[PDB]
């Protein structure tokens, strides 16, 4: 911008959306990337592969299409993230994808976080992904227990649109139950 000699960062760098150094180390595996992302309200998991004119998403799942299988709960929590990973994972298996490397983009590797939940979900779907068990939240938290107890400290329902009062991780179970099943229209 200042002159002929000025160096402008690559576009995805200005936009502060792509860590190119991590990207490179990621691509060095030769495997597909399980692109785990999250929004204030949603969570998205994509299986991306390298292409001539750009990346190629072979399969993917969004927390939105989770309802499509019987989900009346919010979509920005742990149970949401895990199930979304599993959904994307299952679809990945469908398209012939068998292994991946977790790409958490610009999110932090916080133990028990959602990007890791997406990963645990994707792994259960039968996908082979290099991981570390002691960095994944404990089963119960994945189910959504942590939020149930929070609702126990009631006085005012945690959720506005009455999905339920004391909330239900058992719903998480019903949905995972529905996904791990064969039938399911992926």
Partner 1 sequence: FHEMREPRIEKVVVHMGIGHANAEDILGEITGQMPVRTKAKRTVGEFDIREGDPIGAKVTLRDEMAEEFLQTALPLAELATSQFDDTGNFSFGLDVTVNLVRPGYRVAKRDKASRSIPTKHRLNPADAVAFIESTYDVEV
Partner 2 sequence: PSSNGPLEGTRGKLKNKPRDRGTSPPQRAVEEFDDGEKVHLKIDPSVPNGRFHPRFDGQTGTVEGKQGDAYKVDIVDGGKEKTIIVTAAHLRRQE
Partner RNA sequence: CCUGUCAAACUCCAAACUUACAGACGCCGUUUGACGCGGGGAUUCCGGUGCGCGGGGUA
Partner RNA sequence: AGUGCAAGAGCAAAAGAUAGCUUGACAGUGUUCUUCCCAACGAGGAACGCUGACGCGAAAGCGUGGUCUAGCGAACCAAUU
Partner RNA sequence: UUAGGCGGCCACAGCGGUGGGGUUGCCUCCCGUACCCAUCCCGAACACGGAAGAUAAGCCCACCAGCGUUCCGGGGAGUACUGGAGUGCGCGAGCCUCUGGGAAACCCGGUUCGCCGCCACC
Choose one: 15-23, 95-103, 157-165, 175-183; the region binding partner 2 (CB under 8 A).
15-23
Rounded to the nearest whole angstrom, what is the least distance from the CB of residue 56 to partner 2 in the complex? 13
Give the contact letters, 63-102, x = binds to partner 1 (CB under 8 A), - = no: ----------------------------------------
Q: Which of 110, 99, 108, 126 is nearest to 34 (CA)?
A: 99
Site for RNA in 107-166 (CB under 7 A): 107-115, 130-132, 135, 137, 141, 144, 146-147, 149-150, 153, 158-161
Burial per residue of 29-46, b for 16 or more beta-carbon CB atoms within 10 angstroms, e otherwise: eebbbbbbbbeeebbbbb
Applying the rule CB under 8 A, the residues between 17 and 46 that interact with partner 1 are 17
SS3 of residue 160 by DSSP: coil
* Residue 179 is a binding residue for RNA (CB under 7 A): no
Contact flag: residue 57 with RNA (CB under 7 A)? yes
Beta bridge partners of 101: 33
**31 lies in the site for partner 2, by CB under 8 A:** no
Is residue 127 within 8 A of residue 86, CB to CB? The reply is: no
Q: Does 15 bind partner 1 (CB under 8 A)?
A: yes
Q: Which of 16, 21, 51, 185 binds partner 1 (CB under 8 A)?
A: 16
User: Can you tell me which residue has the tokens 């119960």?
Assistant: 140
Out of 2, 14, 24, 182, which residue is the one contacting partner 2 (CB under 8 A)?
Answer: 24
* Minimum CB distance to partner 2 smaller for 2 or for 40: 2
Sheet of strand 101-103: strand arrangement: 56-62, 43-49, 33-38, 101-103
Spatial distance between the Cα atoms of 79 and 171, rounded to a whole number of angstroms: 9
Q: Which parts of 19-95 are beta strand (E)?
A: 33-38, 43-49, 56-62
Q: Which residue ranges make up the site for partner 2 (CB under 8 A)?
A: 4-5, 7, 9-10, 20-21, 23-24, 27-28, 50
């Amino acid at each position: 911008a200042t002159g002929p000699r000025y160096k402008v960062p690559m576009r995805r760098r200005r936009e502060a959306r792509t860590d190119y150094h991590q990207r490179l180390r990621l691509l060095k595996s030769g495997k597909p990337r399980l692109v785990a992302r999250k929004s204030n309200k949603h969570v998205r998991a994509q299986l991306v592969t390298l292409g001539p004119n750009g990346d190629d998403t072979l399969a993917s799942a969004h927390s939105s299409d989770l309802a499509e299988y019987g989900w009346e709960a919010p979509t920005g929590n742990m149970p949401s993230a895990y199930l979304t990973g599993l959904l994307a994972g299952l679809r990945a298996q469908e398209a012939g994808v068998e292994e991946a490397v977790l790409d958490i983009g610009l999110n932090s590797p916080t133990p028990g976080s959602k990007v890791f939940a997406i990963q645990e979900g994707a792994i259960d779907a039968g996908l082979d992904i290099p991981h570390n068990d002691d960095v994944l939240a404990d089963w119960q938290r994945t189910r959504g227990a942590h939020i149930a107890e929070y609702d126990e400290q009631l006085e005012e329902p945690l959720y506005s649109g009455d999905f339920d009062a004391a909330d239900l991780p058992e719903h998480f179970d019903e949905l995972r139950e529905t996904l791990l099943d064969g039938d399911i229209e992926l």
